[PDB]
Amino acid sequence: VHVVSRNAEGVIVVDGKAYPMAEELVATESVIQRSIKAVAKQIADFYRPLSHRDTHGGGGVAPISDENPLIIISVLKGSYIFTADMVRYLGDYGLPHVVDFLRVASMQLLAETQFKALRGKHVLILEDIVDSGKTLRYILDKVQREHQPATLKVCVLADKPGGRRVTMQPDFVCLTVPNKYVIGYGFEVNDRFRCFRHIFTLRPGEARRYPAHL
Amino acid sequence: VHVVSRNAEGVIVVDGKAYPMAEELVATESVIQRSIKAVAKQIADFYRPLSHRDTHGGGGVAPISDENPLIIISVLKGSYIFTADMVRYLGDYGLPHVVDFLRVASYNKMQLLAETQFKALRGKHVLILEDIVDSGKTLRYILDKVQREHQPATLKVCVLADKPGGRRVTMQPDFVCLTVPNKYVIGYGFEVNDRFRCFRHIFTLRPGEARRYPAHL
Numbered sequence: 001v002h003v004v005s006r007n008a009e010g011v012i013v014v015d016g017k018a019y020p021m022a023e024e025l026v027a028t029e030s031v032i033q034r035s036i037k038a039v040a041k042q043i044a045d046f047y048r049p050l051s052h053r054d055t056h057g058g059g060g061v062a063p064i065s066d067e068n069p070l071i072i073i074s075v076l077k078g079s080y081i082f083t084a085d086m087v088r089y090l091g092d093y094g095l096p097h098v099v100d101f102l103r104v105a106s107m108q109l110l111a112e113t114q115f116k117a118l119r120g121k122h123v124l125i126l127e128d129i130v131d132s133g134k135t136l137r138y139i140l141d142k143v144q145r146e147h148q149p150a151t152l153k154v155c156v157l158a159d160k161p162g163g164r165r166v167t168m169q170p171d172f173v174c175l176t177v178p179n180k181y182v183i184g185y186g187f188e189v190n191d192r193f194r195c196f197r198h199i200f201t202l203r204p205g206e207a208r209r210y211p212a213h214l
Numbered sequence: 215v216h217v218v219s220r221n222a223e224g225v226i227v228v229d230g231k232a233y234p235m236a237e238e239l240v241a242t243e244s245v246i247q248r249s250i251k252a253v254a255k256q257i258a259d260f261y262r263p264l265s266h267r268d269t270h271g272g273g274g275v276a277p278i279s280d281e282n283p284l285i286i287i288s289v290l291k292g293s294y295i296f297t298a299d300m301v302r303y304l305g306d307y308g309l310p311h312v313v314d315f316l317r318v319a320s321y322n323k324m325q326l327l328a329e330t331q332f333k334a335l336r337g338k339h340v341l342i343l344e345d346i347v348d349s350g351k352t353l354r355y356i357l358d359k360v361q362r363e364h365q366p367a368t369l370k371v372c373v374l375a376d377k378p379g380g381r382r383v384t385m386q387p388d389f390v391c392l393t394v395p396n397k398y399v400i401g402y403g404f405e406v407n408d409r410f411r412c413f414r415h416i417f418t419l420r421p422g423e424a425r426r427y428p429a430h431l
């Protein structure tokens with residue numbers, strides 16, 4: 001049970017910790033973790049019945065297994081904490097899977113996947129948030145063209161449906177967030193706030209608090 | 215509490231789940247998490263009182279703060295789950311920090327697969343987060359490179375696991391969460407061709423299981 005209050009300075013306090021950069025609390029760790037574990041069950045239930053290219057035994061089609069696992073591509077740097085939690089829940093539900101990473105920046109690709117045999121494989125992208133939809137459209141087109149997967153789906157921790165600029169509907173969504181700048185649980189302002197266990201909205205203008213390049 | 219036993223086939227069972235690839239249990243999730251948080255407290259206690267280059271106020275020196283955080287470089291892919299947990303414990307202890315990533319591989323000789331994107335580490339306290347120190351060659355390569363290319367004020371290493379018997383070059387990380395036996399470990403980031411990373415516990419691998427997945431991913 002989380003204790004949420006405001007101190008005399010009007011600042012949000014969660015379990016004794018003050019968040020002076022926060023406007024509102026979106027989700028506590030308990031709510032976030034329950035939502036991720038629920039989507040993990042959905043992903044495991046959806047993929048465990050499926051089959052795809054057998055690269056372990058030289059063809060043809062074979063069930064998703066430890067021999068031929070679901071391929072997960074995690075988008076760095078935003079999705080690493082979400083990914084770490086999600087994979088452990090996928091393991092709890094017994095879904096065979098392997099994870100590789102691509103790195104994008106604001107588009108530029110900074111780091112490519114090292115996986116080289118995704119042709120005819122079921123591929124799932126783990127992403128932090130779908131807001132405008134532009135980042136995912138860039139990643140999806142790149143992965144489809146270079147890897148030619150059997151299927152390509154997207155699981156996001158957060159959906160901000162009010163921010164869309166292009167058509168993007170993830171296949172799996174853990175949480176819906178307000179039409180505001182969110183921080184915490186991987187969400188950042190110049191790499192700050194990613195380690196928070198809860199998700200908050202940012203006080204307006206605080207997005208410029210750390211102008212110095214790291 | 216965890217229950218650890220062997221079933222009628224002699225297979226290790228932890229909390230109702232069988233681990234047929236495992237030879238021995240090294241650490242349960244509870245022991246791992248307690249050990250990471252304890253080191254997080256040590257890291258926070260060590261860095262909290264220190265100062266380094268001020269890149270926020272373009273000044274000289276300032277305390278470690280959200281304006282001038284500790285710089286953490288996490289070594290992919292093995293350290294990503296460990297890093298996710300450690301940063302949350304570091305936040306619990308109030309240590310201001312930011313995380314970037316590098317990736318290295320061996321051909322054994324070392325090569326950089328992915329570079330960090332941080333470009334202002336000169337005069338900064340830098341902490342490397344690595345999954346394991348075994349031979350010491352991977353960390354010798356990384357420390358020599360970060361020191362020469364970034365000129366940090368200080369450079370320290372935190373490892374989830376130390377395999378002391380594996381050393382071929384001198385390497386003692388400043389912070390160690392767990393000490394592992396001199397064997398192939400799996401679980402909590404440790405893997406066989408990317409399998410077993412999602413396990414919440416760390417185990418030793420049965421000797422005949424290391425070549426179970428020969429196909430490149």
Ligand SMILES: O=c1[nH]c(=O)c2nc[nH]c2[nH]1
Nearest residue numbers: 129131180181182187188
């Ligand atoms: O920190 C962040 N907060 C957001 O709300 C967001 N939307 C897209 N990308 C984002 N990053």
Ligand SMILES: O=c1[nH]c(=O)c2nc[nH]c2[nH]1
Nearest residue numbers: 346348397398399404405
């Ligand atoms: O999975 C792993 N187990 C080990 O024991 C090890 N040592 C170095 N790198 C390693 N990876």
